[PDB]
Design a protein around this ligand. Structure first.
Ligand SMILES: [Zn+2]
Lengths: 148, 472, 50, 137
C-alpha cells in the first residue's frame, strides 16, 4: 500500500518471495547454460535455504531483513502465537467508547451515568431510524446533519 | 572436518579451496585444449555436407535479401568486398565435387569438405549446423532402438549377435535372410513383423538419403563431433573451477547494496563462465585483466536489475549514481550542500527531470517496523484501507432505488419504460435512442423527445420534491 | 451509477471536477487562531496571503 | 454459503496446482512510473484479478454490461476487486526442496520414517555426502 507522501509501505513477505523467484530463476539459467557442477550445487543449496526462510525463519542463520537490521517475518511467524491466535483468541470492536469514572452516589443499583457526548456517538444509527420514522428528516443524509 | 556448519558461505568457501590457482603457463596450456576442443568439432562438421546447403543458399538469400550481410560470415580464416569472391569458390569447387559421387567418388566432396573450414561463421548461423545434424541423430538413434523394440521385444530375437551385424549399420538385410536361415524359434516369427521393422528402418535410409551420406557417415560425424565437444567442457570446467577465488574478492566490494553476499558470487560465476567462453590468448594479455571486466560487469548489472522492490531500469540507475557522484563534489567544495537549482548547472539536465529523479530512489518501508517508543504495536495497524465505502453511502444508494422505483412509478406505462430503457435503471447496459425505438419500432424525434417532456414532468416540483434532497 | 445519472438529467447539475479535502478543526476543540506559517517550495508563485 | 462442519492434511504437487490461477514467473512488483502492476510479477493482474472494481487494466472494458468478459489485450477479467484477495499463484521450483516443518521439527517425520538420524539427512541435503538408492546386487 502507498503511504501518504510518495513512499510505499510494503509487507516483509515481498522480500522472501522476491528471493525465492530470483534464486529459482537463476537456477534455470544455470542448468540450460551447462555450468560446472561445483556451481549448480551452490545454487541448489542456496535456493532451498531461501525457501526454508520463507516458511519458518529462524531455524537457520536467521536471514536478516534488507535495508534494516531486524529479522524478517516468515509465514510461520504470523500464525505462531503472540500469546493469542491470529483469528479471535483479538477482535477490536465497533460501537464502543471509554472515559474516566467518578462517583455519582445518587444512582440506583441498576443504572450508570453516560455523557451526552458518548450517548450521541455510540447510538448514532439508532437515531437515524427515529428521525425518519418520526418524520422529522426526509432522507438519511438530511438526518446526518441534524445529529451534527 | 565436517563440523556441523550450517551457513552456506563457509560450506562454499572450503568447497572451493580444494583446487589450486593456475600459473601463467597453465592458462595457455588449458586454453590450448579449448581450441583443439573446437578444432575436432569444426572438422567433424565439414564432412557432413548438410551444413553447406543451409549456408551456401544463404548467399543467394544474402544478395536476394533473405538474410543479412553480417550474421552469416565474419571473414575467412587466414561484407560484400571479400565474401563474393571466395563464396563463389565455394560453388566454384561445389560443382566440381558433387560430380564424382553421381576412384575419387568420395574424395571430391572431401576436396570441398577438407576446404570448407576456410569460411568463418558467426554464432547465429553456427548453432543451426550443430543443431540440425544433431537433430538427425535424435531419430535414427532410436530407430536402432526400434529394431530392438520389435525384433527382440516381440519375436525373442537374440540381441547378442544381431547387434554387431546391426549396431549403427541400419542399412543391410542381415536378420532378413541370414538370421532367419538358421530356423530358430525367433527366426520364423520375425517375418510376421519383418516389413514393419523394415518400413520403420526405411526412415533411416530415407534420412541418410535426405543427407546423401550413410548412417556410417551420419553416425560418426554426430559421434566424433560429440567426441571433440566434451573435450572442451573438460577444459572450461578446469579454468572456471580454478579462478573461483577471483570472484570472491571482486564480489566483496559490492557487499552491502541490498543483495546478499551469496547472490553476488553466484552472479559473478555466471559472468566468469562467459569470460572463459570468449577468451582469446593470442592477444597476449593475461586472463585476470580480461575476466575481471566480465565479472565486475555482471555483479553490477544484477545489482541494478534485481535488488530493488519497485524495479527501476538500468538506464535510470546510471543517472542516480551520476547524481550522487556529483552531489558529493558540491558538498565537500561548497561546504554546506547543493540545491536542486544548482545541480542543474553542475549536471546538464533541464532542471525538471532532476526533480523527477529525486523522488524515484527511495525504497519502501517494512510494515513491521515498531513505532516510536517501541510500543507493543507495529506500523501495520495504522494504515487504513480505502477500497471500502462508508455504510452511510451504502445506506443511501439503497434508498435511491426506493425513490426512483416510486417517482418513476407515478409515470405512465411506457413513459416510465423509456426512462428505465434510455437510462440503465433495473437493467443491463442501456440502449441507444434509435436502438430504444427498435422495441417500439418508432425511432424518431418523438422517442428522443418523449424522454425530455416525461422527465420534464418529474421536474415539476412536488413530484421530484423527494428526489431534490438527494443532491447536495 | 444509473440512478445517480437519472437524478442528474432531472436537475442538470454540472459534474464536480475536483474533490474537497480542506483542513478542518478537530472535533470538540475550539479557540482562537494565534498564528499561521506558510512555507513555499522554491519555484512556485506565492499566493496573496503568503 | 453452505454450513461447514474442518479437516487438514498434506498437499500434493497436483493439488497445489489446483488452487492456483496462474504461475508467477518474474519478481517485479509494480512499474515505478505509472503504478499499474506489471505482468507475470508478484502483484500481477492477469493472475490475481483486477485492481479496480469492474474494469480491465488498459481501460477498454470499463462499463458494467461486461461482467465476465476477460480482456483480449491483457487477459484480466472484469469482476470485483475483492477477488484479489482469495486467489493464489504457484512458483515452479526447478528442483525439489525439503519442507522444513517436516524435517527439522523435533521428531523429524522425514527422519523417523526413513529410519535415518537427523544428523545424517542434514548431511545429504547440503550435498556433503551421497546416499545409496536401490543398491541391488
Ligand atoms: Zn485490457
Amino acid at each position: 500500500v502507498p503511504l501518504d507522501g510518495g513512499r510505499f509501505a510494503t509487507s516483509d513477505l515481498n522480500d522472501l518471495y522476491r528471493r525465492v523467484i530470483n534464486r529459482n530463476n537463476r537456477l534455470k539459467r544455470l542448468l540450460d547454460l551447462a555450468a560446472p557442477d561445483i556451481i549448480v550445487r551452490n545454487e541448489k543449496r542456496m535456493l532451498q535455504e531461501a525457501v526454508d526462510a520463507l516458511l519458518d525463519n529462524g531455524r537457520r542463520g536467521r536471514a536478516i531483513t534488507g535495508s534494516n537490521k531486524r529479522p524478517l517475518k516468515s509465514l510461520a511467524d504470523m500464525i505462531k502465537g503472540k500469546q493469542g491466535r491470529f483469528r479471535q483468541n483479538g477482535k477490536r470492536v465497533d460501537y464502543s467508547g471509554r472515559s474516566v469514572i467518578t462517583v455519582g452516589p445518587y444512582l440506583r443499583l441498576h443504572q450508570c451515568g453516560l455523557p451526552k457526548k458518548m450517548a450521541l456517538e455510540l447510538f448514532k444509527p439508532f437515531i437515524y431510524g427515529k428521525l425518519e420514522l418520526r418524520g422529522l428528516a426526509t432522507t438519511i443524509k438530511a438526518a446526518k446533519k441534524m445529529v451534527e | 572436518e565436517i563440523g556441523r556448519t550450517t551457513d552456506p558461505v563457509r560450506m562454499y568457501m572450503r568447497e572451493m579451496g580444494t583446487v589450486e590457482l593456475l600459473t601463467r603457463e597453465g592458462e595457455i596450456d588449458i586454453a590450448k585444449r579449448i581450441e583443439d576442443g573446437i578444432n575436432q568439432v569444426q572438422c567433424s562438421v565439414a564432412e557432413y555436407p548438410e551444413a553447406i546447403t543451409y549456408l551456401l543458399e544463404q548467399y543467394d538469400r544474402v544478395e536476394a535479401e533473405e538474410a543479412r550481410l553480417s550474421d552469416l560470415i565474419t571473414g575467412f580464416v587466414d561484407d560484400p568486398e571479400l565474401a563474393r569472391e571466395k563464396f563463389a569458390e565455394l560453388r566454384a569447387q561445389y560443382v566440381v565435387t558433387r560430380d564424382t559421387i553421381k576412384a575419387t567418388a568420395q574424395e571430391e566432396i572431401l576436396k570441398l569438405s577438407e576446404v570448407f573450414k576456410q569460411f568463418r561463421l558467426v554464432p547465429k548461423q553456427f548453432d543451426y549446423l550443430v543443431n540440425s545434424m544433431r537433430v538427425m541423430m535424435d531419430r535414427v538413434r532410436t530407430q536402432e532402438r526400434l529394431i530392438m523394440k520389435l525384433c527382440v521385444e516381440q519375436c525373442k530375437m537374440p540381441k547378442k549377435n544381431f547387434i554387431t551385424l546391426f549396431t549403427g549399420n541400419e542399412t543391410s538385410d542381415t536378420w532378413f535372410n541370414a538370421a532367419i536361415a538358421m530356423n530358430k524359434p525367433w527366426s520364423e516369427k520375425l517375418h510376421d513383423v519383418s516389413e514393419e521393422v523394415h518400413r520403420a528402418l526405411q526412415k533411416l535410409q530415407q534420412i541418410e538419403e535426405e543427407t546423401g551420406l550413410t548412417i556410417e557417415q551420419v553416425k560418426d560425424i554426430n559421434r566424433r563431433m560429440s567426441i571433440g565437444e566434451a573435450k572442451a567442457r573438460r577444459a572450461k570446467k578446469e579454468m572456471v573451477e580454478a579462478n573461483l577465488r577471483l570472484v570472491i574478492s571482486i564480489a566483496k566490494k559490492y557487499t552491502n547494496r541490498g543483495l546478499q553476499f551469496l547472490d553476488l558470487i553466484q552472479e559473478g560465476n555466471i559472468g566468469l563462465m562467459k569470460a572463459v567462453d570468449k577468451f582469446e590468448y593470442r592477444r597476449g594479455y593475461k586472463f585476470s585483466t580480461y575476466a575481471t571486466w566480465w565479472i565486475r560487469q555482471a555483479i553490477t548489472r544484477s545489482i541494478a536489475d534485481q535488488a530493488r522492490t519497485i524495479r527501476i531500469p538500468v538506464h535510470m540507475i546510471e543517472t542516480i549514481n551520476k547524481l550522487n557522484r556529483i552531489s558529493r563534489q558540491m558538498l565537500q567544495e561548497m561546504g554546506r550542500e547543493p540545491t536542486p537549482e544548482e545541480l542543474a548547472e553542475r549536471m546538464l539536465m533541464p532542471e525538471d527531470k532532476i526533480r523527477k529523479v529525486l523522488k524515484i530512489a527511495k525504497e519502501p518501508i517494512s510494515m513491521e517496523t515498531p513505532i516510536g517508543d517501541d510500543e507493543d504495536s507495529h506500523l501495520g495497524d495504522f494504515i487504513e484501507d480505502t477500497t471500502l465505502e462508508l455504510p452511510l453511502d451504502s445506506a443511501t444508494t439503497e434508498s435511491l432505488r426506493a425513490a426512483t422505483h416510486d417517482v418513476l412509478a407515478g409515470l405512465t406505462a411506457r413513459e416510465a419504460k423509456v426512462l428505465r430503457m434510455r437510462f440503465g435503471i433495473d437493467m443491463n447496459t442501456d440502449y441507444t435512442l434509435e436502438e430504444v425505438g427498435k422495441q417500439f419500432d418508432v425511432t424518431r424525434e418523438r422517442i428522443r423527445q418523449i424522454e425530455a417532456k416525461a422527465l420534464r414532468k418529474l421536474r415539476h416540483p412536488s413530484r421530484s420534491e423527494v428526489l431534490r434532497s438527494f443532491l447536495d | 451509477t444509473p440512478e445517480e445519472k437519472l437524478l442528474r438529467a432531472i436537475f442538470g447539475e454540472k459534474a464536480s471536477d475536483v474533490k474537497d479535502s480542506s483542513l478542518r478543526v478537530p472535533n470538540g476543540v475550539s479557540g482562537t487562531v494565534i498564528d499561521v506559517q506558510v512555507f513555499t517550495r522554491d519555484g512556485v508563485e506565492k499566493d496573496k496571503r503568503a | 454459503t453452505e454450513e461447514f462442519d474442518i479437516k487438514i492434511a498434506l498437499a500434493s504437487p497436483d493439488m497445489i496446482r489446483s488452487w492456483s490461477f496462474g504461475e508467477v514467473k518474474k519478481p517485479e512488483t509494480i512499474n515505478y512510473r505509472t503504478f499499474k502492476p506489471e505482468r507475470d510479477g508478484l502483484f500481477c493482474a492477469r493472475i490475481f484479478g483486477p485492481v479496480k472494481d469492474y474494469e480491465c487494466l488498459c481501460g477498454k472494458y470499463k462499463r458494467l454490461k461486461h461482467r465476465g468478459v476477460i480482456c483480449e489485450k491483457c487477459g484480466v477479467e472484469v469482476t470485483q476487486t475483492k477477488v484479489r484477495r482469495e486467489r493464489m499463484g504457484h512458483i515452479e521450483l526447478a528442483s525439489p526442496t525439503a519442507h522444513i516443518w517436516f524435517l527439522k521439527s523435533l521428531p523429524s517425520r522425514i527422519g523417523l520414517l526413513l529410519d535415518m538420524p537427523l544428523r545424517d539427512i542434514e548431511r545429504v541435503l547440503y550435498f556433503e555426502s551421497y546416499v545409496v538408492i536401490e543398491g541391488g546386487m
